Ligand binder design. Structure first.
Ligand SMILES: Cc1cc2nc3c(=O)[nH]c(=O)nc-3n(C[C@H](O)[C@H](O)[C@H](O)COP(=O)(O)OP(=O)(O)OC[C@H]3O[C@@H](n4cnc5c(N)ncnc54)[C@H](O)[C@@H]3O)c2cc1C
Ligand SMILES: O=C(O)c1ccc(-c2cccc(Cl)c2Cl)o1
Ligand SMILES: [Ca+2]
Length: 445
């Protein structure tokens, strides 16, 4: 039985643990945090995530999709809130097959941990990786007190998130060629209670967005009709725009309330605990990190956020990490040796990681005239050639097309629409048959 040590019992690490353990690998998984399945008197955790077809399919292959979806809220469309216009519900597709799922992160992690243990993995909590000695094949772990314990390893999977210690250890024995692109937005998680969301008729089966240019809020539903709201706002006001809002201007929760009342007036009344959430929840940081290599020989590999931190604006980070886990287990299972597997994994996944990293950054702008007309012509082309003209968002979210192919086809589509609408003011002026022939010329089924 082949041996593997996984660092991080998050989303990627627990899935890859299950996939390898059920294929007969001897799997030990090490997690810095306590076991979330051991109920304590601590406050619950209400962060949720959008699960799309890529993540769902990964869970399906692992036999866990049914259990996860039973605890998830269907989101049938995007609900865009702008003051002065009623909320506009933009359906994701023609029917409920094209939806995304709002799942509580803690509940998803618990289901995955059970799945990993059911397949035979051993999971060891309260042990955080501190360092790796690659030449001696040993690693050093410790609890929160820092009491150190050493373990031998044969294959090390770094599934330990965007601040990966495995990545830090690798960067010392190989040049990972890291390129860090900091994101100026921080984020803050806020809460809408079930009573408030019902009082204001907030639609439960939708993803909600309050755009406001350089900042915005999103809200995702929970099973009990509460919503988790996330504010995205610059950490600092730019020099050469020092008045603009930023976390630095919001000195306390009362300042945050004044900010919401002015900039997000239909949302502020739903946020009963704004002042306390704002002061008690930490401001998060965002970034894009691109690595030239993801592995050290056959000894260690990164996946998930450890390999490709991305901005969250496409809701694909977890979905990508679960897709990584499937791919890594597949390569390891069937390769000639571990070094071959890890090289092949990296070669397969790196172009797609770059693509979603880029599309996630682009997606922020797109959710921040000419646009209507292009989107209108695109809807017609999707009706005439539904196997050829598929909106990029739909390729990313509702299909398993490799992200880089989705991005390439999306650019062909966006250029074709922009050129077709240029020098036209309405659609009856446009030759739909000529556009369709360009679709069938440039977009294979
Ligand atoms: C605000 C926000 C919103 C998001 N929304 C979405 C969304 O809607 N949909 C989506 O698909 N993605 C979303 N994402 C992205 C998603 O959260 C991540 O991409 C995903 O959790 C990555 O999974 P992972 O298993 O690689 O890492 P994680 O889920 O972070 O798990 C890493 C694990 O490693 C552990 N760990 C860390 N360091 C060590 C160490 N030294 N030793 C041992 N254990 C360690 C951690 O405790 C954790 O258990 C969002 C991200 C943010 C910030
Ligand atoms: O229509 C969508 O799928 C949509 C709009 C906004 C998002 C999103 C999802 C997860 C995390 C974050 Cl930050 C965002 Cl902005 O998803
Ligand atoms: Ca420790």
């Amino acid at each position: 039985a082949r041996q593997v040590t996984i660092i991080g019992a998050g989303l990627a690490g627990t899935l890859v643990a299950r996939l390898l353990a059920r294929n007969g690998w001897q799997v030990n998984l090490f997690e810095r945090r306590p076991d979330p399945r051991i109920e304590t008197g601590a406050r619950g955790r209400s962060i949720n995530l959008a699960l799309a077809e890529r993540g769902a399919h990964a869970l399906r292959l692992a036999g866990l999709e049914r259990e996860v979806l039973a605890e998830a809220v269907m989101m049938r469309g995007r609900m865009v809130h702008v003051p002065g216009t009623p909320p506009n519900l933009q359906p994701y597709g023609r029917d409920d097959s094209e939806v995304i799922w709002s799942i509580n992160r803690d509940r998803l992690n618990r289901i995955l941990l059970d799945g990993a243990e059911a397949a035979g993995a051993s999971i060891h909590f309260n042990l955080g990786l501190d360092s790796v000695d690659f030449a001696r094949q040993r690693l050093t772990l410790s609890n929160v007190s820092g009491e150190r314990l050493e373990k031998r390893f044969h294959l090390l999977i770094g599934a330990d998130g965007c601040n990966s210690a495995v990545r830090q250890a690798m960067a010392s024995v190989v040049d990972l060629g890291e390129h860090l692109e900091t994101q100026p937005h921080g984020y803050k998680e806020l809460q809408i209670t079930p009573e408030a969301s019902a009082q204001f008729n907030l639609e439960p089966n939708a993803l909600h967005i309050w755009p406001h240019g350089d900042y915005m809020c999103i809200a995702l539903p929970n099973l009990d009709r509460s919503f988790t709201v996330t504010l995205f706002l610059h950490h600092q006001s730019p020099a050469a725009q020092p008045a603009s809002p930023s976390f630095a201007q919001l000195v306390d929760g009362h300042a945050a309330r004044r900010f919401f009342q002015r900039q997000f007036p239909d949302l502020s009344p739903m946020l009963d605990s704004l002042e306390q959430d704002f002061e008690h929840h930490p401001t998060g940081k965002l970034a894009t990190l691109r690595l030239t290599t993801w592995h050290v020989g056959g000894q260690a590999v990164l996946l998930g956020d450890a390999a490709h931190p991305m901005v969250p604006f496409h809701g694909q980070g977890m979905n990508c990490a679960l897709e990584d886990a499937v791919a890594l287990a597949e390569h390891l299972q069937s390769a000639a040796d571990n070094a071959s597997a890890l090289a092949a994994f990296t070669a397969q996944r790196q172009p797609d990681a770059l693509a979603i990293q880029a599309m996630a950054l682009e997606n922020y702008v797109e959710m921040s005239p000419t646009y209507l007309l292009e989107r209108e012509l695109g809807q017609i082309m999707a009706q005439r050639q539904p196997t050829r003209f598929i909106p990029r968002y739909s390729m990313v979210t509702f299909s398993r097309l490799p992200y880089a192919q989705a991005m390439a086809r999306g650019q062909i589509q966006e250029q074709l629409l922009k050129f077709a609408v240029a020098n036209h003011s309405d659609l009856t002026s446009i030759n739909l048959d000529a556009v369709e022939h360009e679709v069938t010329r440039c977009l294979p089924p």
